[PDB]
Amino acid sequence: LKYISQLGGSVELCRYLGDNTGALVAVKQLQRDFQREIQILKALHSDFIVKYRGVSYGPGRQSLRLVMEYLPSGCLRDFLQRHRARLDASRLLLYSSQICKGMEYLGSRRCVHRALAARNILVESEAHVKIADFGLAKLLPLDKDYYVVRPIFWYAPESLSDNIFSRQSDVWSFGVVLYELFTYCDKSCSPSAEFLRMMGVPALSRLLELLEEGQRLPAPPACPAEVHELMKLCWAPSPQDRPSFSALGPQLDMLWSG
Numbered sequence: 001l002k003y004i005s006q007l008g009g010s011v012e013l014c015r016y017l018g019d020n021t022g023a024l025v026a027v028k029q030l031q032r033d034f035q036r037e038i039q040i041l042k043a044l045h046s047d048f049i050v051k052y053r054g055v056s057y058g059p060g061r062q063s064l065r066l067v068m069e070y071l072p073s074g075c076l077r078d079f080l081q082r083h084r085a086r087l088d089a090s091r092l093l094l095y096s097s098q099i100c101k102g103m104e105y106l107g108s109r110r111c112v113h114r115a116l117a118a119r120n121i122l123v124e125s126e127a128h129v130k131i132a133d134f135g136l137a138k139l140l141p142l143d144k145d146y147y148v149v150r151p152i153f154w155y156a157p158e159s160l161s162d163n164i165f166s167r168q169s170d171v172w173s174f175g176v177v178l179y180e181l182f183t184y185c186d187k188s189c190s191p192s193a194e195f196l197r198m199m200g201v202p203a204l205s206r207l208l209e210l211l212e213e214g215q216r217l218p219a220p221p222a223c224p225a226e227v228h229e230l231m232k233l234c235w236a237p238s239p240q241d242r243p244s245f246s247a248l249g250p251q252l253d254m255l256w257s258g
């Protein structure tokens with residue numbers, strides 16, 4: 001495990017015979033505890049979720065490291081921004097469907113991802129993406145569909161207000177992911193940029209007022225109408241009115257098909 005460089009807690013690129021011939025891996029370390037993260041990712045087997053490879057130990061064997069596949073093509077956000085000129089609406093719908101299906105898998109395991117955003121979706125290749133960054137992921141109790149704890153423009157209003165997270169706070173987030181995809185993560189119309197135009201006062205305060213009045217992110221000018229409608233659903237004021245990942249999935253698959 002020879003350190004190379006910083007990819008993102010902290011994630012580091014490492015090369016795993018001594019002859020510098022070993023494969024590259026991504027390695028997460030801290031500097032609480034990601035014992036939970038390791039257990040969650042190890043159980044998950046999906047073509048749309050980054051692949052666990054094992055564990056190793058840190059200095060003195062006092063520390064665990066999480067060993068995962070490294071995707072050099074990097075995060076979807078950067079991929080979109082560089083190559084916007086040559087990625088079509090069909091390819092974005094493909095990405096959307098893949099992400100949706102990984103979220104379904106998570107939901108069936110009572111897993112709240114919480115961090116879902118284009119920056120922690122990885123490009124395995126041009127036509128295949130995988131969900132990563134399980135650092136804030138938390139499993140729901142068997143008897144309860146949310147939790148409470150002690151990046152504002154991705155979070156549902158009840159998360160911002162009352163510190164509630166659920167699978168439906170994830171759905172609000174996935175809506176914001178669709179928005180990232182169909183704006184190719186352009187800085188000029190980022191969630192944060194749109195926010196600053198929507199008031200010409202603390203951000204979080206003003207954001208919660210805007211959301212309460214029903215103001216949402218505008219359709220990307222090049223976005224298919226049916227994808228915009230999905231986004232607005234995902235940003236339903238009440239958690240219970242947002243569609244499930246299971247209800248979204250067919251729509252995006254229907255859209256991608258066409």
Ligand SMILES: O=S(=O)(F)c1cccc(-c2cn(C3CCCCC3)c3c2cnc2[nH]ccc23)c1
Nearest residue numbers: 007008011026068069070071072074120132133
């Ligand atoms: O040098 S960069 O341009 F920043 C650069 C370049 C190429 C790849 C990455 C990268 C970033 N992360 C994580 C994912 C989200 C949160 C932390 C950062 C990766 C990457 C590659 N494989 C990975 N396997 C598991 C996670 C992971 C980063």
Ligand SMILES: NC(=O)Nc1ccccc1
Nearest residue numbers: 153191194195216217235
């Ligand atoms: N979900 C959503 O539309 N959020 C939002 C609204 C205005 C500005 C920034 C973010």
